[PDB]
Amino acid sequence: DVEFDALLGSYCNTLSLVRFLELGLSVACVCTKFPELAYMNEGRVQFEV
Amino acid sequence: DVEFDALLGSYCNTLSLVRFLELGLSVACVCTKFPELAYMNEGRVQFEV
């Protein structure tokens, strides 16, 4: 008598990464990284027409 | 805690200046400059058919 229990394969997954600069919705924003946002209070962006 | 509040930008526009001459309306009129319209009394154009 011989009886075994095999393992016939093991399948993994590749997590995928989106950059958000690589997509189309990035046109809709002017991104600038401001490292002092944490140290800030109130931002103003002023207009004259 | 060090804080600030920033002016993050200032935007202006350009008031755009149109000339009656770059138009298609100007084909519907003969335009002449007549600095003495002030001193005129009655102008007349006369026709013969």
Coordinates of all heavy atoms in Angstrom, one line a residue, unseen atoms left out:
Chain A
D1 N 0.8 -1.2 0.0 CA 0.0 0.0 0.0 C 0.9 1.2 0.0 O 1.9 1.3 0.7 CB -0.9 0.0 1.2 CG -1.9 1.1 1.3 OD1 -2.8 1.2 0.4 OD2 -1.7 1.9 2.2
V2 N 0.5 2.2 -0.8 CA 1.1 3.5 -0.8 C 0.0 4.5 -1.1 O -0.7 4.4 -2.1 CB 2.2 3.7 -1.9 CG1 2.7 5.1 -1.9 CG2 3.4 2.8 -1.6
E3 N -0.2 5.5 -0.2 CA -1.1 6.6 -0.4 C -0.5 7.9 0.0 O 0.0 7.9 1.2 CB -2.4 6.3 0.3
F4 N -0.4 8.8 -0.8 CA 0.2 10.1 -0.4 C -0.8 11.2 -0.6 O -2.0 11.0 -1.1 CB 1.5 10.4 -1.2 CG 1.4 10.4 -2.6 CD1 1.1 11.6 -3.3 CD2 1.6 9.3 -3.4 CE1 1.0 11.6 -4.7 CE2 1.6 9.3 -4.8 CZ 1.2 10.5 -5.4
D5 N -0.4 12.4 -0.2 CA -1.2 13.6 -0.4 C -0.3 14.6 -1.1 O 0.7 15.0 -0.6 CB -1.7 14.2 0.9 CG -2.7 13.4 1.5 OD1 -3.2 12.5 0.9 OD2 -3.0 13.6 2.7
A6 N -0.7 15.0 -2.3 CA 0.3 15.9 -3.1 C -0.1 17.4 -2.8 O -1.0 17.7 -2.2 CB 0.2 15.5 -4.5
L7 N 0.8 18.2 -3.4 CA 0.5 19.6 -3.5 C 0.8 19.9 -5.0 O 2.0 19.8 -5.4 CB 1.3 20.5 -2.6 CG 0.8 21.9 -2.5 CD1 1.0 22.4 -1.1 CD2 1.7 22.8 -3.3
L8 N -0.2 20.2 -5.8 CA 0.0 20.2 -7.2 C 0.3 21.6 -7.8 O 0.4 21.7 -9.0 CB -1.3 19.6 -7.9 CG -1.4 18.1 -8.0 CD1 -0.2 17.5 -8.5 CD2 -1.8 17.5 -6.7
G9 N 0.3 22.6 -7.0 CA 0.7 23.9 -7.4 C 0.4 25.0 -6.4 O -0.3 24.8 -5.5
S10 N 1.1 26.2 -6.5 CA 0.7 27.3 -5.7 C 0.8 28.6 -6.5 O 1.8 28.9 -7.1 CB 1.6 27.4 -4.5 OG 3.0 27.7 -4.9
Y11 N -0.3 29.4 -6.5 CA -0.4 30.5 -7.3 C -0.5 31.8 -6.5 O -1.2 31.8 -5.5 CB -1.7 30.3 -8.2 CG -1.5 29.1 -9.0 CD1 -2.4 28.1 -8.9 CD2 -0.5 28.9 -9.8 CE1 -2.3 26.9 -9.6 CE2 -0.3 27.8 -10.6 CZ -1.2 26.8 -10.5 OH -1.1 25.7 -11.2
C12 N 0.3 32.8 -6.9 CA 0.3 34.0 -6.2 C -0.3 35.1 -7.1 O -0.7 34.9 -8.2 CB 1.8 34.3 -5.8 SG 1.9 35.7 -4.7
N13 N -0.3 36.3 -6.5 CA -1.0 37.4 -7.1 C 0.0 38.6 -7.2 O 0.8 38.8 -6.3 CB -2.2 37.8 -6.3 CG -3.1 38.7 -6.9 OD1 -3.3 38.5 -8.1 ND2 -3.7 39.6 -6.2
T14 N 0.0 39.3 -8.3 CA 0.8 40.5 -8.4 C -0.1 41.7 -8.2 O -0.9 42.1 -9.0 CB 1.4 40.6 -9.8 OG1 0.4 40.5 -10.8 CG2 2.4 39.4 -10.0
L15 N 0.2 42.4 -7.0 CA -0.4 43.7 -6.8 C 0.0 44.7 -7.8 O 1.2 44.7 -8.2 CB -0.1 44.1 -5.4 CG -0.7 45.4 -4.9 CD1 -2.2 45.1 -4.7 CD2 -0.1 45.7 -3.5
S16 N -0.9 45.5 -8.3 CA -0.6 46.4 -9.4 C -0.6 47.8 -8.8 O -1.4 48.1 -7.9 CB -1.6 46.3 -10.5 OG -2.9 46.7 -10.1
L17 N 0.1 48.7 -9.5 CA 0.4 50.0 -8.9 C 0.0 51.1 -10.0 O 0.6 51.1 -11.1 CB 1.8 50.2 -8.5 CG 2.2 49.2 -7.4 CD1 3.6 49.2 -7.0 CD2 1.3 49.5 -6.1
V18 N -0.8 52.0 -9.6 CA -1.2 53.2 -10.4 C -0.6 54.4 -9.9 O -0.5 54.6 -8.6 CB -2.8 53.3 -10.4 CG1 -3.4 52.0 -11.0 CG2 -3.3 53.5 -9.1
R19 N 0.0 55.2 -10.8 CA 0.6 56.4 -10.3 C -0.2 57.7 -10.3 O 0.3 58.7 -9.7 CB 1.9 56.6 -11.1 CG 3.0 55.7 -10.6 CD 3.8 56.5 -9.6 NE 4.4 55.6 -8.5 CZ 5.6 55.1 -8.6 NH1 6.3 55.2 -9.7 NH2 6.1 54.4 -7.6
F20 N -1.4 57.7 -10.8 CA -2.2 59.0 -10.8 C -1.6 60.1 -11.6 O -2.2 61.2 -11.6 CB -2.2 59.7 -9.5 CG -3.1 60.9 -9.5 CD1 -4.4 60.8 -9.7 CD2 -2.5 62.1 -9.4 CE1 -5.2 61.9 -9.8 CE2 -3.3 63.2 -9.4 CZ -4.7 63.1 -9.6
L21 N -0.5 60.0 -12.2 CA 0.1 61.0 -13.0 C -0.1 60.3 -14.4 O -0.2 61.0 -15.3 CB 1.6 61.4 -12.7 CG 1.8 62.3 -11.5 CD1 3.3 62.6 -11.4 CD2 1.0 63.5 -11.6
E22 N -0.1 59.0 -14.4 CA -0.2 58.2 -15.6 C -1.6 58.1 -16.1 O -1.9 57.4 -17.1 CB 0.2 56.7 -15.2 CG 1.7 56.6 -14.8 CD 2.6 57.1 -15.9 OE1 2.4 56.8 -17.1 OE2 3.7 57.7 -15.5
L23 N -2.6 58.7 -15.4 CA -4.0 58.6 -15.9 C -4.5 60.0 -16.3 O -3.8 61.0 -16.3 CB -4.8 57.9 -14.8 CG -4.8 58.4 -13.4 CD1 -5.7 59.5 -13.2 CD2 -5.2 57.2 -12.5
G24 N -5.7 59.9 -16.9 CA -6.2 61.1 -17.5 C -6.8 62.1 -16.6 O -6.8 63.3 -16.9
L25 N -7.3 61.7 -15.4 CA -7.9 62.6 -14.5 C -6.8 63.6 -13.9 O -7.3 64.6 -13.2 CB -8.5 61.8 -13.4 CG -9.4 62.3 -12.3 CD1 -10.5 61.4 -12.3 CD2 -8.7 62.2 -11.0
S26 N -5.6 63.4 -14.2 CA -4.5 64.4 -13.7 C -4.6 65.7 -14.4 O -3.9 66.6 -14.0 CB -3.2 63.8 -13.9 OG -3.1 62.5 -13.2
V27 N -5.2 65.8 -15.6 CA -5.2 67.0 -16.3 C -6.0 68.0 -15.5 O -5.7 69.2 -15.4 CB -5.8 66.9 -17.7 CG1 -7.2 66.7 -17.7 CG2 -5.5 68.1 -18.5
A28 N -6.9 67.5 -14.6 CA -7.9 68.4 -14.0 C -7.4 69.0 -12.7 O -8.2 69.6 -12.0 CB -9.2 67.5 -13.6
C29 N -6.1 68.9 -12.5 CA -5.5 69.5 -11.3 C -4.1 69.9 -11.5 O -3.4 69.3 -12.3 CB -5.6 68.5 -10.1 SG -4.7 67.0 -10.6
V30 N -3.7 71.0 -10.9 CA -2.3 71.4 -10.9 C -1.7 71.0 -9.6 O -1.8 71.7 -8.6 CB -2.2 72.9 -11.1 CG1 -0.7 73.3 -11.2 CG2 -2.9 73.4 -12.3
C31 N -1.0 69.9 -9.6 CA -0.5 69.4 -8.3 C 0.9 70.0 -8.0 O 1.8 70.1 -8.9 CB -0.3 67.8 -8.4 SG -1.9 67.0 -8.7
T32 N 1.1 70.5 -6.8 CA 2.3 70.9 -6.3 C 2.4 70.4 -4.8 O 1.5 70.6 -4.1 CB 2.5 72.4 -6.3 OG1 1.5 73.0 -5.4 CG2 2.3 72.9 -7.7
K33 N 3.5 69.8 -4.5 CA 3.7 69.3 -3.1 C 4.2 70.4 -2.2 O 5.3 71.0 -2.5 CB 4.5 68.1 -3.1 CG 5.9 68.2 -3.7 CD 6.6 66.8 -3.5 CE 5.8 65.8 -4.3 NZ 6.4 64.4 -4.2
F34 N 3.5 70.7 -1.2 CA 3.8 71.8 -0.3 C 4.1 71.1 1.1 O 3.1 70.7 1.8 CB 2.6 72.7 -0.2 CG 2.8 73.9 0.8 CD1 3.8 74.8 0.6 CD2 1.9 74.1 1.8 CE1 3.9 75.9 1.4 CE2 2.0 75.2 2.6 CZ 3.0 76.1 2.4
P35 N 5.4 70.9 1.5 CA 5.6 70.1 2.6 C 5.2 70.7 3.9 O 5.2 70.0 5.0 CB 7.2 69.9 2.6 CG 7.6 71.1 1.8 CD 6.6 71.3 0.7
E36 N 4.9 72.0 4.0 CA 4.5 72.7 5.2 C 3.0 72.8 5.4 O 2.6 73.6 6.2 CB 5.2 74.1 5.2 CG 6.6 74.1 5.4 CD 7.3 74.0 4.1 OE1 6.6 74.0 3.1 OE2 8.6 73.9 4.1
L37 N 2.2 72.2 4.6 CA 0.8 72.2 4.8 C 0.4 71.9 6.2 O -0.5 72.5 6.8 CB 0.0 71.2 3.9 CG -0.2 71.4 2.5 CD1 -0.8 70.1 2.0 CD2 -1.3 72.5 2.4
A38 N 1.2 71.0 6.9 CA 0.9 70.7 8.3 C 1.1 71.9 9.2 O 0.4 72.0 10.2 CB 1.7 69.5 8.8
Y39 N 2.0 72.8 8.8 CA 2.3 74.0 9.6 C 1.6 75.2 9.2 O 1.9 76.3 9.6 CB 3.8 74.3 9.5 CG 4.7 73.2 10.1 CD1 5.3 72.3 9.3 CD2 4.9 73.2 11.4 CE1 6.1 71.3 9.8 CE2 5.8 72.2 12.0 CZ 6.3 71.3 11.2 OH 7.1 70.3 11.7
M40 N 0.5 75.1 8.4 CA -0.1 76.2 7.8 C -1.4 76.5 8.5 O -1.9 75.7 9.4 CB -0.3 75.9 6.3 CG -0.8 77.1 5.5 SD -0.9 76.6 3.8 CE -1.7 78.0 3.3
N41 N -2.1 77.5 8.2 CA -3.4 77.9 8.8 C -4.5 78.1 7.7 O -5.3 77.2 7.6 CB -3.2 79.2 9.6 CG -4.4 79.5 10.4 OD1 -5.5 79.0 10.2 ND2 -4.3 80.5 11.3
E42 N -4.4 79.1 6.9 CA -5.4 79.4 5.9 C -4.7 79.8 4.6 O -4.0 80.8 4.6 CB -6.3 80.6 6.3 CG -7.1 80.3 7.6 CD -8.1 79.2 7.4 OE1 -8.7 79.0 6.4 OE2 -8.3 78.4 8.4
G43 N -5.0 79.1 3.5 CA -4.5 79.5 2.2 C -5.5 80.3 1.4 O -6.7 80.2 1.5
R44 N -4.9 81.3 0.6 CA -5.7 82.2 -0.2 C -5.2 82.0 -1.6 O -4.0 82.0 -1.8 CB -5.6 83.6 0.2 CG -6.1 84.0 1.6 CD -7.6 83.8 1.7 NE -8.0 84.2 3.0 CZ -8.4 85.4 3.4 NH1 -8.2 86.4 2.6 NH2 -8.8 85.7 4.6
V45 N -6.1 82.0 -2.6 CA -5.7 82.2 -4.0 C -6.6 83.2 -4.6 O -7.7 82.9 -4.9 CB -5.8 80.8 -4.7 CG1 -5.6 81.0 -6.2 CG2 -4.9 79.8 -4.2
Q46 N -6.0 84.4 -4.9 CA -6.8 85.5 -5.2 C -6.9 85.8 -6.7 O -6.0 85.6 -7.5 CB -6.3 86.8 -4.5 CG -5.0 87.3 -5.0 CD -4.5 88.4 -4.2 OE1 -5.0 88.6 -3.1 NE2 -3.5 89.1 -4.7
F47 N -8.0 86.4 -7.1 CA -8.4 86.7 -8.5 C -8.8 88.1 -8.7 O -9.4 88.8 -7.8 CB -9.6 85.8 -8.9 CG -9.3 84.4 -8.8 CD1 -9.6 83.7 -7.6 CD2 -8.8 83.7 -9.8 CE1 -9.3 82.4 -7.5 CE2 -8.5 82.4 -9.7 CZ -8.8 81.7 -8.6
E48 N -8.5 88.6 -9.9 CA -8.9 89.9 -10.4 C -9.4 89.8 -11.8 O -8.6 89.3 -12.6 CB -7.8 91.0 -10.3
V49 N -10.7 90.0 -12.1 CA -11.2 90.0 -13.4 C -11.8 91.4 -13.7 O -12.6 91.9 -13.0 CB -12.2 88.9 -13.6 CG1 -11.6 87.6 -13.2 CG2 -13.4 89.1 -12.7
Chain B
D1 N 4.6 74.4 18.1 CA 3.7 74.5 17.0 C 4.1 75.8 16.2 O 4.0 76.9 16.8 CB 2.2 74.6 17.5 CG 1.7 73.3 18.0 OD1 2.4 72.2 17.8 OD2 0.7 73.3 18.8
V2 N 4.5 75.6 15.0 CA 4.7 76.8 14.1 C 3.8 76.8 13.0 O 3.6 75.8 12.3 CB 6.2 76.8 13.7 CG1 7.1 77.1 14.8 CG2 6.6 75.5 13.0
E3 N 3.0 77.9 12.8 CA 2.0 78.0 11.9 C 2.2 79.3 11.0 O 2.9 80.2 11.3 CB 0.6 78.1 12.5
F4 N 1.5 79.3 9.9 CA 1.5 80.4 9.0 C 0.2 80.3 8.1 O -0.5 79.3 8.2 CB 2.7 80.5 8.1 CG 3.0 79.4 7.2 CD1 2.5 79.3 5.9 CD2 3.7 78.3 7.7 CE1 2.7 78.3 5.2 CE2 3.9 77.2 6.9 CZ 3.4 77.2 5.6
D5 N -0.1 81.4 7.4 CA -1.2 81.3 6.4 C -0.7 82.0 5.2 O -0.2 83.2 5.3 CB -2.5 81.9 6.9 CG -2.4 83.2 7.5 OD1 -1.3 83.7 7.6 OD2 -3.4 83.8 7.9
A6 N -0.8 81.4 4.0 CA -0.1 81.7 2.8 C -1.0 82.2 1.7 O -2.1 81.8 1.6 CB 0.7 80.5 2.3
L7 N -0.5 83.1 0.9 CA -1.1 83.5 -0.3 C -0.5 82.6 -1.4 O 0.6 82.7 -1.8 CB -0.8 85.0 -0.6 CG -1.6 85.7 -1.7 CD1 -1.7 87.1 -1.3 CD2 -0.8 85.7 -3.0
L8 N -1.3 81.7 -1.9 CA -0.8 80.6 -2.8 C -0.9 81.0 -4.3 O -0.5 80.2 -5.1 CB -1.6 79.3 -2.6 CG -1.2 78.4 -1.5 CD1 0.3 78.1 -1.5 CD2 -1.5 78.9 -0.1
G9 N -1.3 82.2 -4.6 CA -1.3 82.6 -6.0 C -2.2 83.9 -6.2 O -3.0 84.2 -5.3
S10 N -2.0 84.6 -7.3 CA -2.8 85.7 -7.7 C -3.0 85.6 -9.2 O -2.1 85.5 -9.9 CB -2.2 87.0 -7.3 OG -1.0 87.2 -7.9
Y11 N -4.3 85.7 -9.6 CA -4.6 85.5 -11.0 C -5.3 86.8 -11.5 O -6.1 87.4 -10.8 CB -5.5 84.3 -11.2 CG -4.8 83.1 -10.9 CD1 -4.9 82.5 -9.7 CD2 -3.9 82.5 -11.8 CE1 -4.2 81.4 -9.4 CE2 -3.3 81.4 -11.5 CZ -3.4 80.8 -10.3 OH -2.7 79.7 -10.0
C12 N -5.0 87.2 -12.7 CA -5.6 88.4 -13.4 C -6.0 87.9 -14.7 O -5.6 86.8 -15.2 CB -4.6 89.5 -13.5 SG -5.2 91.1 -14.0
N13 N -6.8 88.6 -15.4 CA -7.1 88.3 -16.8 C -6.7 89.4 -17.7 O -6.2 90.4 -17.3 CB -8.6 88.0 -17.0 CG -9.5 89.1 -16.8 OD1 -9.1 90.3 -16.8 ND2 -10.8 88.9 -16.6
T14 N -6.9 89.2 -19.0 CA -6.6 90.2 -20.0 C -7.9 90.7 -20.5 O -8.7 89.9 -21.1 CB -5.7 89.6 -21.1 OG1 -6.4 88.6 -21.8 CG2 -4.4 89.1 -20.6
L15 N -8.2 92.0 -20.4 CA -9.3 92.5 -21.0 C -9.0 92.6 -22.5 O -8.0 93.2 -22.9 CB -9.6 93.9 -20.5 CG -10.7 94.7 -21.1 CD1 -12.0 94.0 -20.8 CD2 -10.8 96.1 -20.4
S16 N -9.8 92.0 -23.3 CA -9.5 91.8 -24.8 C -10.2 92.9 -25.5 O -11.3 93.3 -25.2 CB -10.0 90.4 -25.2 OG -11.4 90.3 -25.1
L17 N -9.5 93.4 -26.5 CA -10.0 94.6 -27.3 C -10.3 94.2 -28.7 O -9.4 93.6 -29.4 CB -8.9 95.7 -27.2 CG -8.7 96.2 -25.8 CD1 -7.6 97.2 -25.7 CD2 -10.0 96.9 -25.3
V18 N -11.5 94.4 -29.1 CA -12.0 94.1 -30.4 C -12.1 95.3 -31.2 O -12.3 96.3 -30.6 CB -13.4 93.5 -30.3 CG1 -13.3 92.2 -29.5 CG2 -14.3 94.4 -29.7
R19 N -11.9 95.2 -32.5 CA -11.9 96.2 -33.4 C -13.1 95.9 -34.2 O -13.4 94.8 -34.5 CB -10.7 95.9 -34.2 CG -10.1 97.1 -34.8 CD -9.7 98.0 -33.7 NE -8.7 97.4 -32.8 CZ -7.9 98.2 -32.1 NH1 -8.0 99.5 -32.2 NH2 -7.0 97.6 -31.4
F20 N -14.0 96.9 -34.5 CA -15.1 96.7 -35.3 C -14.7 96.1 -36.7 O -15.3 95.3 -37.3 CB -15.9 98.0 -35.5 CG -17.1 97.9 -36.3 CD1 -18.2 97.1 -35.9 CD2 -17.3 98.7 -37.3 CE1 -19.3 97.0 -36.6 CE2 -18.5 98.7 -38.0 CZ -19.5 97.9 -37.6
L21 N -13.6 96.6 -37.2 CA -13.0 96.2 -38.5 C -12.7 94.7 -38.7 O -12.9 94.3 -39.8 CB -12.0 97.2 -38.9 CG -12.5 98.6 -39.4 CD1 -11.4 99.5 -39.8 CD2 -13.4 98.5 -40.5
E22 N -12.3 94.0 -37.7 CA -12.1 92.6 -37.8 C -13.5 92.1 -37.4 O -13.7 91.7 -36.2 CB -11.0 92.1 -37.0
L23 N -14.4 92.0 -38.3 CA -15.8 91.6 -38.1 C -16.4 91.4 -39.5 O -15.8 91.8 -40.5 CB -16.7 92.6 -37.3 CG -16.6 92.8 -35.8 CD1 -17.7 93.7 -35.4 CD2 -16.6 91.5 -35.1
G24 N -17.5 90.7 -39.5 CA -18.2 90.6 -40.8 C -19.3 91.7 -40.8 O -19.8 92.0 -41.9
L25 N -19.7 92.3 -39.7 CA -20.6 93.4 -39.7 C -20.1 94.5 -40.5 O -20.9 95.3 -41.1 CB -20.9 93.9 -38.3 CG -21.7 93.3 -37.2 CD1 -21.5 94.2 -36.1 CD2 -23.1 93.3 -37.7
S26 N -18.8 94.8 -40.5 CA -18.3 95.9 -41.2 C -18.5 95.8 -42.7 O -18.3 96.8 -43.4 CB -16.8 96.0 -40.9 OG -16.1 94.8 -41.3
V27 N -19.0 94.7 -43.2 CA -19.3 94.7 -44.6 C -20.7 95.4 -44.8 O -21.0 95.8 -45.9 CB -19.4 93.3 -45.3 CG1 -20.5 92.5 -44.8 CG2 -19.3 93.4 -46.8
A28 N -21.5 95.4 -43.8 CA -22.8 96.0 -43.9 C -22.8 97.5 -43.7 O -23.9 98.1 -43.6 CB -23.7 95.4 -42.8
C29 N -21.7 98.1 -43.7 CA -21.6 99.6 -43.5 C -20.4 100.1 -44.2 O -19.3 99.5 -44.2 CB -21.5 99.9 -42.0 SG -20.0 99.3 -41.2
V30 N -20.5 101.3 -44.8 CA -19.4 102.1 -45.2 C -19.1 103.0 -44.0 O -20.0 103.7 -43.5 CB -19.7 102.9 -46.4 CG1 -18.6 103.8 -46.8 CG2 -20.2 102.1 -47.5
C31 N -17.9 102.9 -43.5 CA -17.5 103.8 -42.4 C -16.5 104.8 -42.9 O -15.5 104.5 -43.6 CB -16.8 103.0 -41.3 SG -17.7 101.5 -40.8
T32 N -16.8 106.1 -42.5 CA -15.8 107.2 -42.8 C -15.7 108.0 -41.5 O -16.7 108.2 -40.8 CB -16.1 108.0 -44.0 OG1 -17.4 108.7 -43.8 CG2 -16.2 107.2 -45.2
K33 N -14.5 108.6 -41.3 CA -14.3 109.5 -40.2 C -14.5 110.9 -40.7 O -13.9 111.3 -41.7 CB -12.9 109.3 -39.7 CG -12.6 108.0 -39.1 CD -11.2 107.9 -38.5 CE -11.0 106.6 -37.8 NZ -11.9 106.4 -36.7
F34 N -15.4 111.6 -40.0 CA -15.7 113.0 -40.4 C -15.7 113.8 -39.1 O -16.7 113.9 -38.4 CB -17.1 113.0 -41.1 CG -17.5 114.4 -41.5 CD1 -16.8 115.1 -42.4 CD2 -18.7 114.9 -41.0 CE1 -17.2 116.3 -42.8 CE2 -19.1 116.1 -41.4 CZ -18.3 116.8 -42.3
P35 N -14.5 114.4 -38.8 CA -14.4 115.1 -37.5 C -15.3 116.3 -37.3 O -15.4 116.8 -36.2 CB -12.9 115.5 -37.5 CG -12.5 115.6 -38.9 CD -13.3 114.5 -39.6
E36 N -15.9 116.8 -38.4 CA -16.8 118.0 -38.3 C -18.3 117.6 -38.2 O -19.1 118.5 -38.4 CB -16.6 118.9 -39.5 CG -15.3 119.5 -39.6 CD -14.3 118.7 -40.3 OE1 -14.6 117.6 -40.7 OE2 -13.1 119.1 -40.4
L37 N -18.6 116.4 -37.9 CA -20.0 116.1 -37.6 C -20.6 117.0 -36.5 O -21.8 117.3 -36.5 CB -20.2 114.7 -37.1 CG -20.2 113.5 -38.1 CD1 -20.3 112.3 -37.3 CD2 -21.4 113.7 -39.0
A38 N -19.7 117.6 -35.7 CA -20.2 118.5 -34.7 C -20.7 119.8 -35.4 O -21.7 120.3 -35.0 CB -19.0 118.9 -33.7
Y39 N -19.9 120.3 -36.4 CA -20.3 121.5 -37.0 C -21.2 121.4 -38.2 O -21.7 122.4 -38.7 CB -19.0 122.2 -37.5 CG -18.1 122.6 -36.4 CD1 -17.1 121.7 -36.0 CD2 -18.2 123.8 -35.9 CE1 -16.3 122.1 -35.0 CE2 -17.3 124.2 -34.9 CZ -16.4 123.3 -34.4 OH -15.5 123.7 -33.4
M40 N -21.6 120.2 -38.6 CA -22.5 120.1 -39.6 C -23.9 120.4 -39.1 O -24.1 120.6 -37.9 CB -22.5 118.7 -40.2 CG -23.4 118.4 -41.4 SD -23.4 116.7 -41.7 CE -21.9 116.6 -42.6
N41 N -24.9 120.5 -40.0 CA -26.2 120.9 -39.7 C -27.1 119.9 -40.3 O -27.8 119.2 -39.5 CB -26.5 122.3 -40.3 CG -27.8 122.9 -39.8 OD1 -28.7 122.2 -39.4 ND2 -27.9 124.2 -39.9
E42 N -27.1 119.8 -41.6 CA -27.9 118.7 -42.3 C -26.9 118.1 -43.3 O -26.4 118.9 -44.2 CB -29.1 119.2 -42.9
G43 N -26.7 116.8 -43.3 CA -26.0 116.1 -44.4 C -27.0 115.5 -45.3 O -28.1 115.1 -44.8
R44 N -26.7 115.3 -46.5 CA -27.6 114.7 -47.5 C -26.8 113.9 -48.5 O -25.7 114.2 -48.9 CB -28.4 115.8 -48.2 CG -29.5 116.4 -47.4 CD -30.0 117.6 -48.1 NE -28.9 118.5 -48.5 CZ -29.1 119.6 -49.2 NH1 -30.3 119.9 -49.7 NH2 -28.0 120.4 -49.5
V45 N -27.5 112.8 -49.0 CA -26.9 112.0 -50.0 C -28.1 112.1 -50.9 O -29.2 112.1 -50.4 CB -26.9 110.6 -49.4 CG1 -26.6 109.7 -50.5 CG2 -25.9 110.5 -48.4
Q46 N -27.9 112.1 -52.2 CA -29.0 112.2 -53.1 C -28.9 111.2 -54.2 O -27.9 110.9 -54.6 CB -29.1 113.6 -53.7 CG -28.1 113.8 -54.8 CD -27.8 115.3 -54.8 OE1 -28.4 116.1 -54.2 NE2 -26.8 115.6 -55.6
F47 N -30.0 110.6 -54.6 CA -30.0 109.5 -55.6 C -30.8 109.7 -56.9 O -31.7 110.5 -56.9 CB -30.6 108.2 -54.9 CG -29.8 107.7 -53.8 CD1 -30.1 107.9 -52.5 CD2 -28.7 106.9 -54.1 CE1 -29.4 107.4 -51.5 CE2 -27.9 106.4 -53.1 CZ -28.3 106.6 -51.8
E48 N -30.5 109.0 -57.9 CA -31.2 109.1 -59.2 C -31.4 107.8 -59.6 O -30.5 107.0 -59.6 CB -30.2 109.6 -60.2 CG -30.5 110.9 -60.9 CD -29.4 111.2 -61.9 OE1 -28.9 110.2 -62.5 OE2 -29.0 112.3 -62.1
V49 N -32.6 107.5 -60.1 CA -32.8 106.2 -60.6 C -33.5 106.4 -61.9 O -34.5 107.1 -61.9 CB -33.5 105.1 -59.7 CG1 -33.1 105.4 -58.3 CG2 -34.9 104.9 -59.9

